[PDB]
Design an enzyme around this catalytic site. Structure first.
Site, PDB file in Angstrom:
ATOM      1  CB  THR G   1      -0.935   0.001   1.199  1.00  0.00           C
ATOM      2  CB  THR G   2       2.391   3.414  -1.915  1.00  0.00           C
ATOM      3  OG1 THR G   2       3.299   2.376  -1.528  1.00  0.00           O
ATOM      4  CG2 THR G   2       3.135   4.738  -1.953  1.00  0.00           C
ATOM      5  CB  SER G 141       4.646  -1.146   2.503  1.00  0.00           C
ATOM      6  OG  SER G 141       3.964  -1.198   1.263  1.00  0.00           O
TER       7      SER G 141
END
Lengths: 5, 222, 215, 222, 223, 222, 234, 215, 215, 5
Positions: G1-2, G141
């Site tokens: 996830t970003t 992350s």
């Protein structure tokens, strides 16, 4: 009383 | 700490030492461990000093409170039951290093034979109690040595004076075999305290008589 | 006597409602139009309840304001509990009716308020707007076209019965509502709409120069 | 930290050091550890500094509150009991590293003999208390060295000034053998604080007198 | 345990196996794991059998209670939210070994397009939910094998019959690769249960049709 | 993080760095750690950034609440007591890593001598407080280096400007010896923040003066 | 996830990826992680998906509840405080693996200069918040790689379109260096979601614009790979 | 009629206060002097509230004794909570006024008491002593020179007005107070002072041979 | 008849209000100026509520002091919960109106007080000051220029109607306020201002030599 | 009553 709208 | 109690014809006597220690270091030299809870009973408590003092104070307060409220003193069985309840309720704190083992000696006014009215009661860590029938009992670290000395010396007990001498000698033996029990301090003039209970009530033994008995014992063993 | 108590409560509430300003809510092409006579600038008689539900009231301010806060709390709790589309104006009207029918009989003084609940269809959906009118006693009436509350409702209702027209534009509906309400400038009118063309939240007040241009 | 107290004919004197440390790092050089709770008692508390200050403040508040409510000051035994109750109640926090052991010195106005009206009371971590009969007592990390010095030096006490000198010398020895106890700081002019209690009440010893005594001791030992 | 669900044009179908085990020992051979919660949704729950049965019963009771109280059934999002709340509340017991992962399949009557009104919703251990877009999902120990089989077999789904056949074949593959999932038992005549939902509601698939499909699949596999 | 405070004749000054880190990663470059709680006191809090901000906000709210309720601001001792109570109450959460150590600097308008009205108060993790009498104090990871630099540089403090320069130099030394403390960032134009308190109240120092002082120090040490 | 967010003259833009994983297994390919909480703020949550969805839902409900009750929306500082309080209250559950780190982007209408009204706020696990001054921030992350890419690419941001392109490229780099972040899926036609906030409010970027920007970025990367060499060798 | 009931309560409180003994409190050079006509040796009408705050009362003993205990509790709690110097006589007077007003309004019978709160400056400080008189209904009045409570106050007040002198010594103030109170020996006088020269606690009773020599 | 008993309640409240001193609050160039006839030095009728909100009251002290404490508590709680700028005088006025209405409807005796809440613009911002007056029954009226409370307000209001001028300086506004108040010295006047030029906290009392120089 | 301001 008072404050009737 | 060592507290002894023995029965003689016509009464009962209880005596205890004066030393309090913190490990190997001596912190007290004139601690009084025998209390006169009421006119006819005396209580000596071994273990932690603070817990012993608190127990004696609270027990005396409870007994006097009941006597004032009802106008009639508790029977001896009632006093035993209250002390046992206190010991049982202190079990959780005793498991944390705050153990207190009391020794109860009293004179039963309502007993049939006055010559055998003396009573000695011992307690365990679980709150159980037992009325001694062998005529003597001891509590504390030096309890075993004092009881083994009294076993041999009890045949000489015929009155209050002989019983007091035997109790002093038992305390001397306990202090001789145990470092946590203090002996007679001739340099500072400090001697064990004793209480004599009979039909006329409980009184404190004067220090001079105990000093004389201790000096006689020391000269006997010198 | 319960008869005398009910009569006294009904007359007291009816005299307290008429001792107040007038609010008119009518349905138009784009949804529901709220027009209220309010000289005050801080106190408002028109408010949003949920995404597609409006609120109008007339009477004692401190009572219907508390009722409005309770309704907002109920609507938000229901929306978060199940879903936003599970909240309907019918449920809010039922809750208001139960609350007012309990207060009218249990409390010493019945509430001198008259509530209006308006609901429009969701975005991209076709459905006629629903207007609910809840009175002081706890009765709920379904009005298909317009609701008049506060003051002398009879002349305004008579004017609306003659001037109303379905599927009217916002400007025409506003003119009709103002004409019926006179029987006023931007400094004494509280105007808000439930615009059915809005994506999620339909409530939208119309004040300032935007209001001035319309009328 | 080290706090000492000794009896002299006609009163009592209590003194304490000024150093507070965080491990091996010196964080305080002018901490005052002796408080005047009321007109006739002084309390010195060793251990955690925050707990000591809180205990002194709360104890003074409680004593003054009782005096104002009842219109009569508490007896000495009552003050001892309240302090012991506070210490006993602090046991749970003390087991977490917030230990605080107080030392109590007072002048009993209700005592029979004015020359023996001084009182010194020591407390243990379990809340127990004991009235010292040897005429001197000490608490803190360097308490053993100060107590052993006072054992030799107590024969020289005949008045208030001699008792103050002996207390200052005992504190000097405690700081000499303990790193956590601060000695007289001649560079900064910081000296231990002392309180003298007699029939006229409790007063703070001026810094000049203690400075002169400390300089005399230093010149004697060099 | 393995429960599968897939979308076909005009509806949705969900099927589940029948085996329940206690370690390596087989304790049940006729367990039913697919429930008809209401007229347009079906719920299959994997994990501990007792927790699954209690979950299905409580969920059906809650949905019917709301429908009777409000006089109108919950929207699909509301049902999803209630099931997610139950799953989230069961987390502490799930950490103690009472895990239960449900699978939700339903037909939305308010959907604009009747042909694509089928819905499949999957839930995680933390209560999070995701509306499936690829048209198939599976839960249970053998879920991965059944999902990978459906990935290859989904191109053949054109109606309810083909979808049911694909679901049965996916369950057969999951039982073939997982020992905790029971396959079609020809000796005892026990076959996986299935539910088909369409515009007319949710109905139970008769056992004879599933038995015929299972026999056809077995004959195809054996050559 | 490093926050310094020192006394000069007629007032007091407090300065702090701008860096906040997460392990070895730099997460903040313009953090403000010195707050103006009221018209005459400034508070700088080290430790966890969130806890520091919440503490400053809550402390200012409490002080203003009392001032509005009673119509008179708290005495300096009252403010010290409230801050100590907050620190003591945060002990349980600090044991979990949410530690906050505040530094309090203020100007006492009720003090007798105007030139000695400045006050510096330091706190420990147990809630204890001590009014610094040596004229300077520091908190944070780089507190030791800044304090040791101020020990040498304190003789040059004669007014507000010299005190500000000494505080900036102490922060520069702390950043030079500690990687968790940020130095003057000439590339981004970010400099430490400072607050000066005197008889006229507490004001924020303009960035231009601090930039000039930092550039002068850098050129001196080049 | 970003999730990334950067400021441009006249507004702000926030974008995020679509992948959700359970260990090394891919469980979701079209997860939406950027929400429009109200007319002028957008919130993205990293970490556990369920906690993220519940956080966004509860935050939007609270903001709308206050606006309806008081008749006036909260100030930006009030919204920051409420989100920080929620994060602080979630700390105990975050210590058990249910972590949620939010990112807040907004447009302050009460700001003096309209061109600098964009606001970016970052939060930590302890509830602390900081208003970013460098003009960009990222969480997740892959946050480090996206932030480092934006550090180099921020000089090209001159309007909303260039800022959107920079955000998409930062997400592309984060997915290129992190396996938990999903890149543009050309086979399935799945692309990152973006929200752009300006003076007219917060709107969702249409998928076609993001798709063509991602396609242009991929073409540029392929061309650069073809042109480049390993110091002389390909 | 609430007005008539309030008048009845006021008259009852006034007669209850009139049945009480007289108390005089006046400011002199060294602080504030309290002189009360107290025949009892165990019951006291003058008491300490805090370091620099005194207390005088007249009326029903079982009421102002409870009020005194409450004031002492409040003062100790405030002193421990913030600081000793944060406690002022003004705050105690305000608390007493609020409590007495609430009791006068809510309780069945109003308290038949009259309170006096006196405060002196701290050590090494110069400030005129403050005298507050709090009545049964809750009114608080600030007196600059002296306060008279209990019994017949008109002749004592007139005598004090004729004989008062600022910056008077302790002996002269005591003589004036006794002379005005007559309009007595150590067997019927309760004397206490708020000696502003004391370092921390100013309250101090004057009894026995010292009192006899003083008067 | 409860309706006629409400007339007695209103008359009692009006008598309580008129049985008090007069307070005037008027807007000027720098914000809002408070002038009160307060002979006492310890009790005050003007106080700060929040950063930009003032407070003025007239009536029974133990009632509006409690109301002031409640308002301060509410303002601080709201400020800490969300933000300092989220607190507005409108919300404080609404809370006061609701509390006073509830007390007037439920409690045995209505609060015989008259409240005034004033708010000024924040630093660096331009906005006309807002003045609110809250009566015992709960009604709130928005006064654009000045508010007069307590005592006989008719002559003071009539004088202000003639002597008032917008954007007047502090000295001219103080002269006008005192002149209308007469229809006093520094020892009987309490003067405070809501200085809009202050950065964060606007409330500031003007007493002593500065007040003497002002008038 | 009393204490009106």
């Amino acid at each position: 009383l008072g404050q009737y709208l | 700490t060592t507290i002894v109690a023995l029965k003689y014809p016509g009464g009962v006597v209880m005596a205890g030492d004066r030393r309090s220690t913190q490990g190997n270091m001596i912190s007290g030299r004139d601690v009084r461990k025998v209390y006169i809870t009421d006119d006819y009973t005396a209580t000596g408590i071994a273990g932690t000093a603070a817990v012993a003092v608190e127990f004696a104070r609270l027990y005396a307060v409870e007994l006097e409170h009941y006597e004032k409220l009802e106008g009639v003193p508790l029977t001896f069985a009632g006093k035993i039951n209250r002390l046992a309840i206190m010991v049982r309720g202190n079990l959780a704190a005793a498991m944390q290093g705050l153990l207190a083992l009391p020794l109860l000696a009293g004179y039963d006014i309502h007993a049939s034979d006055p010559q055998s009215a003396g009573r000695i009661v011992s307690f365990d860590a679980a709150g159980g109690w037992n009325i001694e029938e062998e005529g003597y009992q001891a509590v504390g670290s030096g309890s075993l040595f004092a009881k083994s000395s009294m076993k041999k010396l009890y045949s000489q007990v015929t009155d209050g004076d002989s019983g007091l001498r035997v109790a002093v000698e038992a305390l001397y033996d306990a202090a001789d075999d145990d470092s946590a029990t203090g002996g007679p301090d001739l340099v500072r003039g400090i001697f064990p305290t004793a209480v004599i209970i009979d039909a006329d009530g409980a009184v404190d033994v004067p220090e001079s008589r105990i000093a004389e008995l201790a000096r006689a014992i020391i000269e006997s063993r010198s | 006597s319960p008869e005398q108590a009910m009569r006294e409560r009904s007359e007291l509430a009816r005299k307290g409602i008429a001792r107040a300003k007038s609010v008119v809510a009518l349905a138009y092409a784009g949804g529901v139009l709220f027009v209220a006579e309010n000289p005050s600038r801080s106190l408002q008689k028109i408010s949003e309840l949920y995404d597609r539900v409006g609120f109008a009231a007339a009477g004692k301010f401190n009572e219907f304001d508390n009722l409005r806060r309770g309704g907002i709390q109920f609507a938000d709790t229901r929306g978060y509990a199940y879903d936003r589309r599970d909240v309907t104006g019918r449920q809010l009207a039922n809750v208001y009716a139960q609350t007012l029918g309990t207060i009218f009989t249990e409390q010493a003084k019945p509430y001198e308020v008259e509530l209006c609940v308006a609901e429009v269809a969701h975005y991209g959906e076709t459905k006629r707007p629903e207007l609910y009118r809840i009175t002081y006693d706890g009765s709920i009436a379904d009005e298909p076209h317009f609701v008049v509350m506060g003051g002398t409702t009879e002349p305004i209702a008579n004017a609306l019965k003659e001037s109303y027209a379905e599927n009217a534009s916002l400007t025409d509906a506003l003119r009709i509502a103002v004409a019926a309400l006179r029987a006023l400038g931007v400094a004494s009118l509280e105007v808000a709409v439930l615009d059915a063309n809005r994506p999620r939240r339909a409530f939208r007040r119309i004040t300032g120069s935007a209001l001035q241009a319309l009328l």
